[PDB]
Amino acid sequence: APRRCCLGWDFSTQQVKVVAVDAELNVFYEESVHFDRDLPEFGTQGGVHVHKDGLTVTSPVLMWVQALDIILEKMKASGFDFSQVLALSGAGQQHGSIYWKAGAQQALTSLSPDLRLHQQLQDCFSISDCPVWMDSSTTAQCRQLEAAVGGAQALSCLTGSRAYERFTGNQIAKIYQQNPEAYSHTERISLVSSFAASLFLGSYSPIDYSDGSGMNLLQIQDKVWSQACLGACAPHLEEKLSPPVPSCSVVGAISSYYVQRYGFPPGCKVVAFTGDNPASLAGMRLEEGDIAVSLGTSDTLFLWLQEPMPALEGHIFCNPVDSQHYMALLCFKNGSLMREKIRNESVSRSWSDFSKALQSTEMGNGGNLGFYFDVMEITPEIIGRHRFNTENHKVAAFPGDVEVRALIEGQFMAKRIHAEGLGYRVMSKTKILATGGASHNREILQVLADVFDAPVYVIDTANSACVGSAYRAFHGLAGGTDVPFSEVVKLAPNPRLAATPSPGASQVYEALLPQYAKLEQRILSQTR
């Protein structure tokens, strides 16, 4: 059998990564270009420039273009067989934007295979330093956007999110306000995802519905740009964005540039690029009723949503593997640092003793409940440690083992309560995917399984955006919108079952979840 494959790209904050996935849906090749290490002339740290104000965070667009030259030439030098690539897709670090100068599409459509991309596109950008997801300098544009469309809730119902500083519309509004000459000289605005797709097409790619939802611009229901949001951000913005498309769209064939320079087959299809979190959702193969918990410095919840309920917290996006439905992200600032601090304070400085504390305590923790927010939390907006005993009295401390369970049960009950607030419901078919450092702890995943009353599976997500992108490319080849994504990726490696809810978990948490939710509201009302 000749080995056919799809490429899955990731234009990330710190690097450009690629995976090659074969027709049996196995990864057989991976490569990357690290920005600080491989393009040090740009002077980035973590792939970005943090500006003097401590809020403006950007990346040079030509660094991303040049990184693509380096990685393609690094693949060629390793003997990678580009003639086997049937299709490609990719992921882009979300929210980041690219501003193409007037006349740049002529340079894209007239690329010569004798030259590199960086050389040929060096004068194509009206903005050299692109805002990225880490930028937090647009608070005034956020408040202006919300006020213009009738408020924070009105903006979320419409776009799936209230105004967030990193969301593209607020960044576009600042560039227009502070550099109106460069904005007037911009013919096209892309996301990192659609910018990367444009490079492979040798023409402008549209923005997909899923990454297009991370801008405070797209009407997530109607799948059209909100005229009110467009007008409140910057003038003539719709023509600079172009109509958005379903994520499972063949946006074109690969440019002849890649055919002639690297030996891609002329029939290689470019499937629309999407955001890195939507691509990881595809990579993890979430379906209706499923949830993914990414445990790390920040804890991230990925939800499948048939019918969303946009809120002042979280982000609802159009679903990348099912354009009729949605997905959501909920981010928790107090993640792995709290779990480490509580371990070090309450048990021996090891994860084994943390697990023994969970093994030596009952489900429900005897009615002892805890909230652990040493840094200001996002979901919800609370700071401090708040402990309550079985009589709902506020207490100064717990015994060490009770503390460990109060943290872990509390953190997972909060994820369930906040997911449910966005319209998520546990179903009979529900599978929980857990990833990150803490997913290596069986006792922690047992609490997660017990709290949701659903089985927990463990998966490696180091390349989930790359892998999800290659799956999405295969879905485009296997029939696209005519076939379900889930049927295409049935052949992919299955995740390992790590825990199933204990008998009686349902009875314990059905009574305790509403009490935890009421205590959260009590702490919140004491803040205002």
Ligand SMILES: O=C(CO)[C@@H](O)[C@H](O)CO
């Ligand atoms: O801003 C977000 C999500 O809203 C980050 O996860 C970036 O997508 C990472 O590149």
